[PDB]
Design a protein around this nucleic acid. Structure first.
Ligand SMILES: [Mg+2]
Ligand code: NA
Ligand code: NA
Length: 326
DNA sequence: CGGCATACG
DNA sequence: CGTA
DNA sequence: GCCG
């Protein structure tokens, strides 16, 4: 009965199989570090299936028939239920390769291919990277400079403060423009490692050129540590009592015709959105992105006024943001 | 066997 | 490549 | 790794 696509089932923020899903997500992460995006996707999908189950899995029998559970994912669950630990997962956890690849890829500006090159060159610590600044892009230098702050959870109080300063800059840049919180906080998370805002204006076209004006106004108030269009992946200098901390903020501008598509895309989760786009193309023959939904045979775009419109057109039961935690 | 989301900076 |  |  469990549907095969994550966009076909509700996934709440709090679920009953954290231990099993976290183990499968270790194996997914490790598959990514070794360049196997297909194995990463399967282990991610299997972990997500467990998040959608109504009760704890306590016996191997309860996996029968579940999508994305084959011999490998089932054996991991089996060893966790029988023994409380999966040897493969523990081997990965404790490996120098996994630990270093995790350390490096958590840096803003560094992905798997960069981290892997540095690993092969013998680098192992953040200090090692700092010792060779020539090997770093400007983005990576900013990621490393602010790494301690960026590893500190962002809280709702930070979000609310950031939304106010973004709203102030947006309103100074374009009267009538709006700011919508997206990302994990819109899904109900109480913490995050960044904050996402989606900006539009109710009159189509008025938002042209808006994001550079917003960034200038934020930079003039001393709020920007790093940036650099319609998407800006920033590091903000967020005031705190007596001080400040760096926070990752993403700002996105969309024309209002695209707003429901951008809201859907930027609200996530990442797996939910990959699965939704896969479902759209493979099951419905329609092409989905954060700008629109395209019928390639009629050569037309679907006009949506809400996220609900997008789900209904795809033949999917609507899921509110707090049920998209795939 | 081959696919695996789909953009922008 | 990196970001989402 | 799993599945169409
Ligand atoms: Mg973000
Ligand atoms: Na990174
Ligand atoms: Na986010």
């Amino acid at each position: 009965w469990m549907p095969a696509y994550a966009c076909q089932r509700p996934t709440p923020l709090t679920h009953h199989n954290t231990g099993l899903s976290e183990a499968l997500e270790i194996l997914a992460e490790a598959a990514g570090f070794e360049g196997s995006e297909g194995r990463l996707l399967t282990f991610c999908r299997a972990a997500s299936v467990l998040k959608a189950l109504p009760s704890p899995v306590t016996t191997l029998s309860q996996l029968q028939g579940l999508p994305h559970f084959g011999e490998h994912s089932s054996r991991v669950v089996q060893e966790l239920l029988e023994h409380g630990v999966c040897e493969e997962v523990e081997r990965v956890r404790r490996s120098e390769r996994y630990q270093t690849m995790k350390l490096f890829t958590q840096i803003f500006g560094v992905g798997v291919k960069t981290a892997d090159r540095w690993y092969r060159e013998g680098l192992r610590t953040l200090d090692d990277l700092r010792e060779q600044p020539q090997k770093l892009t400007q983005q990576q230098k900013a990621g490393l400079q602010h790494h301690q702050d960026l590893s500190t959870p962002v809280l709702r109080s930070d979000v609310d403060a950031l939304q106010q300063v973004v709203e102030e800059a947006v309103g100074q840049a374009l009267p009538g423009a709006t700011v919508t919180l997206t990302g994990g906080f819109r899904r109900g998370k109480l913490q995050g490692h960044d904050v996402d805002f989606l900006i539009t204006h109710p009159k189509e076209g008025q938002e042209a050129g808006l994001l550079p004006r917003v960034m200038c106004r934020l930079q003039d108030q001393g709020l920007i540590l790093y940036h650099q269009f319609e998407r800006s992946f920033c590091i903000f200098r967020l005031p705190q009592p007596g001080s400040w901390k760096a926070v990752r903020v993403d700002l996105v501008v969309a024309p209002v015709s695209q707003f429901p598509f951008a809201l859907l895309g930027w609200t996530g989760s990442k797996l939910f959105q990959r699965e939704l786009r896969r479902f759209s193309r493979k099951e419905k023959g329609l092409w989905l992105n954060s700008h629109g939904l395209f019928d390639p045979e009629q050569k037309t775009f679907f006009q949506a006024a809400s996220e609900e419109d997008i789900f209904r057109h795809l033949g999917l039961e609507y899921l509110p943001p707090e049920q998209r935690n795939a």
